[PDB]
């Protein structure tokens, strides 16, 4: 159950989803939680005094923001998502994301096209690390492209 | 009729205006450091 934070109805839906999932064991994801730091503090205080199901998981996807409460950061486990370090890592991540069944399709030339496209994406994204020369401005060349 | 002078007068005008503003502001800062004048809101911010 994925809920985007930012509205009061969003808070109510998130609370209901968490209260149902701690018993049913389902997963709950909340997006852009960095916009409501006080509700983050309340949610962390709620989480500390709780006994969840074995399979329950809570994902709090946020933007790197100093306004996020420190206690929530200490309570949870932090994953940082950011540009891959290099061309090789970028291609590795691109190939990992794409399902194997999709590349290995009936035309045998699809795989080479995918490799070329992944190399192009890696070059485009790695050039972005060089703001004045590689490009003219920090474009949003991302996974959607 | 000369576009050169049309642009050129604008250059000299802005240069003189901004030069006068900067010199007056810096003289005010110097006078504040010497204590001969009080600090105003704009002058206090500029000091900041």
């Amino acid at each position: 159950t994925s809920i985007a934070i930012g509205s009061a109805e969003g808070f109510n839906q998130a609370d209901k989803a968490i209260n149902t999932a701690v018993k049913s064991g389902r997963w709950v994801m909340l997006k852009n939680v960095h916009l409501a730091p006080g509700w983050l503090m309340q949610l962390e205080k709620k989480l500390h005094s709780l006994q969840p199901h074995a399979c329950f998981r809570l994902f709090l996807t946020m933007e790197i923001n100093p306004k996020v409460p420190v206690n929530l950061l200490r309570a949870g486990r932090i994953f940082v998502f950011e540009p891959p370090p290099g061309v090789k890592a970028n291609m590795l991540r691109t190939f990992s994301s794409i399902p194997v069944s999709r590349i290995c399709k009936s035309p045998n030339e699809r795989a080479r096209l995918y490799f070329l496209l992944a190399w192009f994406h890696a070059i485009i994204q790695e050039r972005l690390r060089y703001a004045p020369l590689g490009w003219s401005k920090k474009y949003e060349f991302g996974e959607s492209d | 009729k000369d576009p050169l002078f049309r642009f050129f007068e604008r250059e000299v005008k802005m240069g003189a205006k901004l030069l006068q503003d900067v010199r007056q502001d810096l003289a005010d800062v110097v006078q504040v450091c010497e204590g001969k004048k009080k600090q105003t809101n704009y002058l206090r911010t500029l000091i900041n």
């Binding site: 985007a4 934070i5 930012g6 509205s7 109805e9 997006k31 852009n32 996807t61 949003e140 | 642009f7």
Partner: protein, 1621 residues
């Protein structure tokens, strides 16, 4: 005797006047002909007023007064009877036609049944007697109509659920507002009333075509007039329900558009693949079918021809039939182009322009294909272009046509679009089409971003119209919350329409994140729907929106256009950006747009014109001086090209009229070839861009035009009729008018430019510094247009930033989702409704005030080609063609380019309003308007006397020119000085009139008047041009005037002129003649209302009396404690007709403070001319004194809401009542301001528009001589209690002045925020010494010095922070006392433990430390056993602190501000001392749920106890209790005044009044009125309530508190406890 004749005529008219009645379904007889009665009453009122103007009005004054009375009663009755009738009609249409509302909502159905019974009884009673008066004189008729309106409006707001179900039934209802939806539902039977509601429901359907019976829908029509005739007409008799036959109309429109498109394609295939085309047949085909249909037919024909030609070349080595297609396209283009150069009807002209643009696109595409050597239809160079494929074989007519681009496939929606303006298919537009179609194929959204003016919204609209979709533009802003967007998305899903949410990023970022859910769910639903396995049999994909399952139509889409990097914008969350395919729109192809536009308008040299006009715009944008209001984007070019087309058309019409007038010789080709297109383009450019130019950019742009367009000149036409109207209007308004180079040529030229821009644009901006004639320019233009064209011109002046944006546009309740109209929205909706014929009048909505992106950006869709005002509840208001949006601003520093590019700019420099025009206006107004006939004669004579000086290069102008060279406390504006001078001269005229009145036997001669007027003019110039500067600048201005002037001046060598007044005898008399050495009474020494008269005191009192006598608002600016309030109250005492009311502005002051004061002290009354706000007392002038007018916060956009509110209430003479958006005009109210200099911290300089109206006088600190005189007078008065000490008054006051001067010098505001010293310290010093000396009968010199030193310590050492400062204070007190009092025994008088207490004796005598300590120990034991069992350890500082607190608790209105580290015992010591002094300690109990209402309740309780029960209370309050700024605001008001005006209201106010009456009876006073009782309550609260404020010694916290609540540092004695030493 024509008065009696006209009155008899009107009597006969009204007696014969009968009320027209028409039936309604055999139920009742409605009133008809509202406009006739309305303008009959209006012209009768005008006639009666004109009679009142006549001198013979006296004999028929009573009769005309009674006639006005009954006419106003008719107005009052019929201004609400029409509303009641209409609302009953479209409520009965709901409560009778629909049967579901009975079971759904029965209770207000029964209520409406009763109301309808009452209304029909009233209507039948009216029908019995159709006479107007017999209807009018009915008892209780007005109250009955008002109650009916109240009840019907109550019912109308209680129909939301039924409206939601109706919107569910028919999807297109979602875009229809509350009132409009009830109107549609009620008037289903009366379809003639629904014609004005179709425009907001369909794309271009503005009205439907009905038969004679109004029972069969024959077809539809657009705003232009183009008609679509249904193949199978739909009969509403078979389908009575509104939604059913509306859906049938929609479906029949789709079907008939499909069939007509099929026929049109079949017909146009002949024109295609044809070597030659007959112009007559092609014109017939164009005329036969609609614009969108002919464009679609041309597109289909060209696409099929190109596909067929490409298929031929499949082998590669075949011929090139694409050349045949290109030749065919070129031939057709030539045919249409030759058709354009001759005249056509407007509809056919628009069709030709659309087809020419489309065929230019087709020719360019075909040329590109031929160049690219494309031979295969499957090549991407052909697939990327937008292709149309027609299937006449398809059984379903709607799927006959398929539109494809790349791999995307769409079906034409067949929604009638009307005649829309197509866009030139530039390469950027093609890129947009490709990207957006690719996004739609992936079931994503489109996000074309970029700087404003790049054709983002228009490109999306053009693409949506290309596919035949319903495109909606929503001007998004920060009140588009989650629920409103959910409702909008539900409407889009159910209708099947595109949503263009322009300015998407303006939303709150959290709201964007929330809306991401709805966007993602809709996109997933569409993605599932697009799967081919889904079939018609299964239910359509239902998405979950707002916890509701909503059917999602395939055709829907979501487009958002955002403008990055501007103000008032958010950043989109990444989970939202990934749902939209963004596209960059930065550089539109301006040259191609210009070329195609000019080619379609009929310009033969379009290529050269574009190649000369497009680099010209870059030349202007790069060479002209950079300014905030300059714009040279695509919108400016579009305006120029449209203006050029219009100018060409009017020139052709002029040539035709000339040729038909002079003989008969007309040839279209001869006119076309002989036509100066260069000149037309130059004229359009000058008419569009010259107004916005600054004075030094006009010749630059003219030379640029000469460089790019040599040989052509601009000869602006002379609007002789308009100039005559302007001359007449300027005559009637005492304005200076001049043609060309005369005085006033530039202003009238600007007025003509404004007229031209109003003619072109629907949005204007009169930009220019305050004092440039913008207001007068547009007022004169409006009146001239009214008097010229014969159409009545009205204006609604709205101040945008004087009220909150929620009050300006409206708001939505998050709980009930009910819409309340704002100020601007109400005005626009009322104009659109045209309930009283507002569409026939010229309506101008003028936004006089500051502009920032927060409020103006919601007008983006209004100023666009859309001309829509989009509301959060989904409603859109179409701008009427006669409405103009005007902005009257001084600067556009803070407005974004999106606003700048939308408004025609007219720049008013300060050179436009020459000082000579102001002088002439003043002289004419003086000669015409009486000031109170003797008044007129004296006033004209004075004007004649002042004429030589009020001239160019005269004394006044030269002095004003020298004035700006001086240093003023506030920035010097020309109109401020001029208005001050004019007011003072009017006061001089009134002084002459009073002198004549006091001397009936001997009126003033000419020589006295001449000398008096000359001397007073010099005096007024001196006190107006330098009244707001120091003494040195006043002296310098006096010296300059003495050098330049020629009138007599005082002969004194060293005495400055400003020291002299102008006596009524016409001679200079020094002000010192009015400064007596008065001897103050001993019991009145240093009393609050006692003023020692000195030079500055009398001068400023005279100046304030002069300004307030005119009811002219004024501001006294000076350092704190200088004497501004004292001077004002001293001057106001000479005006017994003016009652002053106290206001205390702070950092968080809002106009709600002024509104509460108005409610408390004034009352709103309904008058024939409108709502007038006047004081409750009759004949008294309320004076609102704002003590800290310049503290209110300036926003990030440089504005103060309360300052704008005051400026609106001063300049326009009133404000707007946001309860019902009714203009309220102030009566008998003026404003007086006081403020520290803006250079002081926390002080914000006032806007130049506000300073224009208010003179400023600078009240500086009294000098050492003035201080010596004043406090020597007090000391001599005080020292009469002790005859033996009478010789020490002079050294005592000398020592006090010396110590105060060194204390001011040593400690400044730089070190600490509270280090302020003023004569207030001397006043408290004298008060303390007098109170100490009052009970004692004898006392030696040493005792007096000891009291003096004790008060010096308690004043100058209490507030200090550092220990070194206190050591310096001690040493300086010692040295000063030794210097001024030699030969006294220092030890007895200056032992270091200087302590005074009245605890060990009945008298305030010095007390030794040990006995005081023992007494404090005993009292502490008693306190422990009684109140608080918290043991305390005594030390010297505790004794000092308790002595200080006891001192404060014994003074009236004595509040405390204790500053020190927490846990130092501040609260405990305060409670202990209050327990000694009998004060009942009150503390507010703060919890996490403590809010503003709880604080208000606590304040109410403490004020009730301390004002009605006469119970002394020590209100102890801590900074931890301050949870909101409202706490501090209420505390500030209570501390400064002793009463909170808005605290008591309604039930609580009546209860307080009863309690105050009981308390006054208990004290034995006889008061019964509410005003006197409230004054007594305020006095008791002042005398009884004490507030002790405790706070931590924060550095920045103290500075913030010094601005958010100035009262703590003025009314509260500040003690710095600090940490324990």
């Amino acid at each position: 005797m024509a008065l009696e004749e006209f009155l008899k005529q009107i009597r006969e008219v009204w007696n014969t006047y009968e009320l027209d009645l028409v039936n309604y379904q055999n139920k009742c007889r409605l009133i008809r002909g509202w406009d006739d009665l309305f303008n009959k009453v209006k012209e009768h009122i005008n006639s009666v007023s004109a009679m009142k103007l006549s001198p013979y009005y006296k004999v028929f004054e009573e009769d005309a007064l009674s006639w006005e009375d009954k006419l106003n009663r008719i107005m009052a009755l019929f201004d609400v009877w029409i509303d009641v009738q209409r609302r009953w009609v479209y409520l009965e249409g709901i409560f009778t036609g629909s049967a579901d509302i009975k079971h759904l909502l029965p209770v207000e159905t029964q209520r409406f049944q009763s109301i309808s019974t009452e209304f029909l009884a009233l209507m039948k009673k009216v029908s019995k007697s159709p006479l107007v008066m017999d209807v009018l004189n009915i008892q209780g008729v007005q109250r009955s109509l008002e109650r009916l309106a109240d009840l019907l409006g109550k019912i109308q707001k209680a129909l939301g659920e039924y409206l939601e179900r109706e919107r569910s039934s028919f999807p297109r209802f979602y875009f229809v507002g509350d009132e409009d939806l009830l109107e549609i539902i009620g008037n289903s039977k009366n379809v003639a009333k629904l014609q004005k509601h179709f425009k907001k429901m369909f794309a271009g359907v503005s009205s439907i075509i009905l038969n004679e019976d109004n029972s069969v829908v024959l077809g539809i029509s657009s705003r232009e007039g183009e008609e679509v005739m249904f193949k199978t007409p739909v009969s509403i008799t078979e389908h009575p329900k509104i939604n059913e036959w509306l859906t049938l109309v929609e479906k029949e429109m789709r079907v008939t558009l499909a069939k007509l498109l099929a026929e049109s394609v079949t017909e146009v295939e002949i024109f295609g693949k044809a070597t030659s085309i007959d112009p007559n047949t092609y014109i017939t085909w164009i005329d036969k079918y609609q614009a969108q249909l002919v464009v679609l037919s041309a597109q289909i024909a060209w696409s099929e021809n190109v596909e067929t030609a490409l298929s031929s070349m499949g082998g590669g080595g075949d011929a090139a039939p694409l050349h045949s297609v290109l030749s065919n396209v070129e031939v057709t283009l030539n045919v249409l182009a030759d058709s354009v150069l001759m005249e056509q009807p407007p509809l056919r002209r628009r069709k030709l322009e659309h087809l020419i643009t489309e065929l230019v696109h087709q020719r360019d595409v075909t040329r590109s294909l031929i160049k690219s050597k494309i031979d295969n239809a499957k090549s991407f160079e052909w697939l990327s272009q937008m292709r149309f494929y027609f299937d006449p074989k398809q059984t379903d007519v709607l799927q006959q046509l398929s539109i494809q681009m790349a791999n995307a496939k769409f079906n034409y929606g067949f929604e009638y679009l009307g005649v829309q303006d197509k866009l030139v298919q530039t390469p950027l537009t093609d890129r947009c089409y490709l990207t957006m179609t690719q996004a739609l194929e992936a079931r994503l959204g489109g996000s074309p971003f970029g700087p404003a003016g790049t054709g983002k919204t228009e490109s999306v609209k053009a693409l949506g119209h290309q596919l035949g979709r319903f495109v909606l533009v929503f001007n998004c802003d920060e009140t588009f919350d989650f629920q409103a967007m959910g409702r909008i998305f539900v409407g889009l899903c159910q209708v099947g329409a595109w949503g263009c949410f322009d300015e998407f990023n303006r939303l709150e970022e959290r709201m964007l994140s929330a809306v991401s859910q709805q966007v993602q769910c809709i996109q997933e639903a569409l993605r599932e729907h697009s799967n081919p396995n889904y079939d018609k049999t299964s239910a359509p994909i239902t998405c979950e929106l707002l916890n509701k399952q909503v059917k999602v139509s395939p055709d829907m889409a979501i487009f958002i256009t955002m403008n990055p990097g501007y103000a008032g914008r958010s950043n989109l969350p990444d989970n939202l950006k990934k749902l939209f395919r963004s596209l960059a729109m930065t550089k539109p192809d301006r040259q191609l747009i210009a070329q195609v536009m000019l080619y379609s308008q009929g310009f033969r040299t379009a290529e050269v014109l574009a190649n000369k006009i497009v680099p010209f715009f870059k030349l202007c944008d790069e060479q002209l001086s950079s300014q905030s209001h300059y714009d040279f984007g695509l919108r400016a070019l579009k305006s120029v090209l449209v203006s050029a087309g219009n100018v060409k058309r009017e020139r052709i019409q002029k040539i035709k009229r000339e040729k038909e007038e002079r003989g008969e010789a007309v040839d279209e080709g001869e006119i076309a070839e002989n036509l100066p297109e260069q000149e037309i383009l130059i004229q359009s450019v000058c008419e569009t861009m010259v107004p916005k130019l600054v004075a030094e950019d006009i010749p630059l742009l003219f030379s640029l035009l000469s460089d790019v367009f040599p040989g052509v000149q601009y000869h602006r036409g002379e609007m002789t009729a308009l100039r005559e109207e302007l001359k007449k209007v300027c005559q009637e308004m005492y304005l200076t008018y001049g043609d060309g180079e005369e005085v006033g040529g530039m202003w009238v030229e600007k007025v003509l430019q404004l007229y031209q821009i109003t003619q072109i644009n629907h949005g204007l901006m009169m930009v220019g510094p305050s004092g440039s004639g913008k207001s007068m320019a547009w007022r004169v233009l409006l009146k001239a247009l009214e008097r010229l064209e014969g159409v009545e011109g009205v204006a609604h002046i709205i101040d945008p930033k004087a009220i909150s944006k929620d009050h300006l546009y409206g708001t939505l309740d998050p709980n009930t989702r009910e819409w309340t109209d704002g100020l601007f929205t109400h005005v626009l909706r009322k104009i659109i409704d045209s309930v009283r014929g507002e569409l026939q009048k010229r309506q101008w909505i003028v936004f006089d005030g500051d502009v920032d992106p927060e409020w103006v950006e919601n007008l983006n869709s209004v100023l666009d080609d859309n001309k829509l005002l989009t509301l959060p509840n989904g409603e859109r208001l179409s701008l009427p063609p006669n409405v103009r949006i005007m902005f009257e601003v001084q600067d556009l520093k803070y407005a974004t380019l999106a606003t700048v590019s939308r408004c025609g700019m007219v720049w008013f420099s300060e050179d436009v309003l020459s000082t000579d025009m102001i002088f002439n206006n003043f002289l004419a107004r003086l000669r015409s308007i009486p000031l109170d006939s003797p008044m007129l004669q004296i006033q004209r004579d004075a004007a004649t006397i002042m004429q030589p000086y009020f001239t160019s290069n005269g004394l006044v102008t030269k002095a004003l020119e020298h004035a700006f060279q001086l240093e003023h406390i506030m920035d010097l504006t020309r109109l401020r000085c001029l208005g001050s001078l004019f007011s003072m001269l009017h006061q001089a005229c009134r002084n002459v009139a009073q002198y004549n009145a006091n001397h009936p036997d001997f009126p003033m001669q000419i020589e006295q008047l001449e000398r008096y007027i000359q001397r007073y003019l010099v005096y007024a110039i001196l006190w107006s041009l330098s009244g707001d500067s120091r003494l040195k600048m006043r002296a310098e201005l006096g010296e300059y005037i003495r050098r330049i002037t020629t009138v007599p001046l005082p002969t004194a060598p060293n005495i400055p002129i400003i020291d002299y007044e102008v006596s009524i005898s016409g001679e200079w008399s020094p002000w010192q003649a009015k400064v007596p050495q008065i001897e103050v009474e001993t019991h009145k020494v240093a009393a609050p209302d006692v003023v020692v008269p000195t030079l500055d005191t009398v001068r400023h009192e005279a100046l304030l009396y002069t300004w307030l006598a005119e009811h002219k608002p004024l501001v006294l600016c000076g350092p704190p404690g200088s004497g501004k309030t004292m001077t004002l109250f001293s001057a106001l005492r000479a005006l017994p007709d003016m009652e002053v009311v106290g206001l205390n502005f702070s950092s968080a002051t809002t106009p709600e403070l002024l509104l509460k004061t108005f409610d408390h002290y004034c009352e709103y009354r309904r008058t024939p001319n409108g709502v007038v706000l006047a004081p409750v007392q009759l004949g008294k002038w309320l004076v609102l004194f704002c003590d800290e007018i310049n503290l209110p916060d300036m926003d990030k956009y440089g504005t103060q809401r309360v300052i704008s509110f005051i400026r609106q209430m001063v300049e326009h003479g009133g404000f707007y009542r946001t309860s019902d958006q009714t203009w309220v005009k102030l009566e008998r109210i003026q404003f007086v301001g006081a403020c520290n200099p803006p250079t002081d911290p926390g002080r914000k300089p006032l806007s130049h528009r506000f300073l224009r109206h208010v003179p400023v006088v600078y009240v500086d600190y009294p000098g050492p001589a003035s201080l010596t005189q004043i406090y020597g007078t007090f000391n001599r008065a005080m020292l009469r209690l002790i005859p033996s000490l009478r010789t020490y008054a002079e050294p005592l006051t000398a020592a006090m002045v010396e110590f105060y001067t060194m204390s001011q010098e040593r400690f400044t505001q730089d070190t600490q925020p509270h280090y302020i010293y003023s004569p207030r310290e001397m006043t408290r010093w004298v008060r303390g010494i007098f109170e100490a000396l009052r009970p004692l009968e004898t006392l030696p010199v040493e005792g007096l010095i000891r009291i003096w030193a004790h008060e010096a310590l308690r004043l100058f050492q209490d507030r200090l922070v550092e220990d070194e400062e206190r050591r310096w204070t001690d040493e300086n007190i010692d040295t000063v006392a030794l210097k001024h009092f030699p030969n006294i025994d220092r030890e007895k008088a200056m032992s270091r433990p200087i302590l005074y207490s009245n605890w060990l004796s009945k008298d305030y005598i010095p007390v030794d430390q040990e006995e005081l300590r023992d007494y404090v120990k005993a009292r502490l034991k008693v306190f422990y056993e009684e109140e608080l069992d918290v043991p305390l350890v005594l030390f010297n500082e505790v004794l000092d602190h308790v002595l200080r607190i006891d001192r404060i608790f014994r003074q009236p209105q004595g509040h405390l501000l204790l500053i020190g580290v927490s846990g130092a015992g501040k609260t405990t010591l305060s409670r202990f001392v209050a327990w000694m002094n009998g004060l009942s300690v009150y503390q507010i109990k703060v919890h996490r749920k403590y809010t503003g209402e709880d604080f208000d309740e606590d304040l109410r309780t403490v004020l009730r106890r301390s004002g009605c029960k006469n119970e002394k209370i020590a209100f102890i309050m801590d900074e931890s209790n301050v949870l909101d700024s409202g706490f501090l605001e209420r505390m500030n008001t209570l501390l400064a005044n002793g009463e909170v005006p808005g605290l008591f209201e309604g039930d609580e106010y009546a209860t307080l009044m009863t309690q105050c009456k009981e308390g006054a009876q208990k004290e034995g006073l006889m008061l019964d009125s509410h005003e006197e009782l409230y004054k007594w309550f305020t006095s008791q609260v002042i005398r009884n309530l004490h507030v002790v404020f405790t706070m931590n010694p924060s550095s920045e916290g103290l500075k913030d508190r010094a601005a958010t609540s100035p009262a703590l540092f003025n009314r509260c004695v500040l003690n710095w406890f600090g940490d324990w030493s």
